[PDB]
From a paper:
Re-annotation of the activity of an earlier enzyme in the pathway, MenD, then led to the recognition that the true enzymatic activity of MenH is to covert the MenD reaction product, 2-succinyl-5-enolpyruvyl-6-hydroxy-3-cyclohexene-1-carboxylate (SEPHCHC) to 2-succinyl-6-hydroxy-2,4-cyclohexadiene-1-carboxylate (SHCHC) by a 2,5 elimination of pyruvate from the cyclohexene ring. EcMenH adopts a typical α/β-hydrolase fold, comprising a core β-sheet of mostly parallel strands surrounded on both sides by α-helices.
In the case of EcMenH the helical lid sits over the loops containing the active site catalytic triad residues and form part of the active site cavity. A notable feature of the active site cavity is the presence of two anions that are consistently found bound in all EcMenH structures, occupying the same sites in each. The sulfate ion forms hydrogen bonded ion pairs with both Arg90 and Arg124, which appear to be the primary determinants of binding. The chloride ion makes one charge interaction, with NH2 of Arg168, and additional interactions at distances of 2.9–3.4 Å from the OH groups of Tyr85 and Tyr148 and the side chain ND2 of Asn233. Given that the SEPHCHC substrate has three anionic groups, the carboxyl groups of the enol-pyruvate moiety, the SEPHCHC ring, and the succinyl moiety, it seems likely that the bound anions in the EcMenH crystal structure indicate key substrate interaction sites. The structure also contains candidates, the main chain NH groups from Leu87 and Phe23, for the classical oxyanion hole of the α/β hydrolases. In most chains of the native and mutant EcMenH structures there is a conserved water molecule located within a suitable distance and orientation to form hydrogen bonds with the NH groups forming this “traditional oxyanion hole”. For the native structure, for example, TS docking with no distance constraints resulted in all solutions being “succinyl-in” for chains A and C, together with the top 3 solutions for chain B. In each case the top solutions agreed to within an rms deviation of 1.5 Å.
Author numbering: 0 to 252
The structure:
């Protein structure tokens, strides 16, 4: 059966694995600047459905994604690991941990939304996301991304940072990207605050000093929050030395 495309790097045999999950439009290169600091651990850089080398892999919902995740982990023979997810990757990570994974130590989430709290909020999100879908599904990505990185969550960016990101993300497939966006929209995602608060596994949170929206969301979660200095929503991209120190504080204790 099919499994997610991933890049594996081996570390010491007695340490767990660091399973890294990128955000929307990203690929398995997202966490590599950070991940490579943890030379003694094994690392698995995963490509989510519709991204990188997993572009052709199609999913309907989160269930399908977490089934691909369970199967990928089994193929790589990962029995002991941590799930590290950024934003979209952060949400598939929380979703996967709550459904249940064999040999999970803990989940580290960076700017991952734990879910909307009412049917009205979900209705707004579904409307706004369906707009984005058609935009990715038709229009040139190079133009769609220019608007994508102007959303309130990316406010803290300067135009120089924004130019680079639009250039990096434009190298993608809009149809597969749109199908993923649809399948895992925050509108369809349950409110996992209860399941996380149940404290079924170790759970940590990171977000940038400048990520006002997710700093706020963290206050609602039963988890430690590491606040990355001089960084925004994608804090590992702006301050990797900061994010390494935070992950090290957690993993090496
Ligand atoms: Cl990003």
């Amino acid at each position: 059966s099919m499994i997610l495309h991933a890049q594996a790097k081996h570390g010491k045999p007695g340490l767990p694995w660091l399973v890294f999950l990128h955000g929307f439009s990203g690929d398995c290169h997202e966490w590599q600047e950070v991940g490579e600091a943890f030379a003694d651990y094994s690392r698995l850089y995963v490509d989510l459905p519709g991204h990188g080398g997993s572009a052709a892999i199609s999913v309907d919902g989160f269930d399908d994604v977490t089934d691909l995740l369970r199967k990928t982990l089994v193929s790589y023979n990962i029995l002991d690991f941590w799930l590290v997810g950024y934003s979209l990757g952060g949400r598939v990570a929380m979703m996967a941990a709550c459904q249940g994974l064999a040999g999970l130590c803990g989940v580290i989430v960076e700017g991952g939304h734990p879910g909307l709290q009412n049917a009205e909020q979900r209705a707004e999100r579904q409307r706004s996301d369906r707009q984005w879908v058609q935009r990715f599904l038709t229009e040139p990505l190079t133009a769609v991304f220019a608007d994508w990185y102007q959303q309130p969550v990316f406010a803290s960016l300067n135009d120089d940072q924004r130019r680079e990101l639009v250039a990096l993300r434009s190298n993608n497939n809009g149809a597969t990207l749109a199908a993923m966006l649809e399948a895992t929209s925050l509108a369809v995602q349950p409110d996992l605050r209860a399941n996380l608060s149940a404290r079924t596994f170790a759970f940590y949170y990171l977000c940038g000093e400048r990520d006002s929206k997710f700093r706020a969301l963290a206050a609602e979660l039963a988890a430690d929050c590491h606040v990355i200095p001089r960084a925004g929503h994608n804090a590992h991209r702006e301050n990797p030395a900061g994010v390494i120190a935070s992950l090290a504080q957690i993993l090496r204790f």
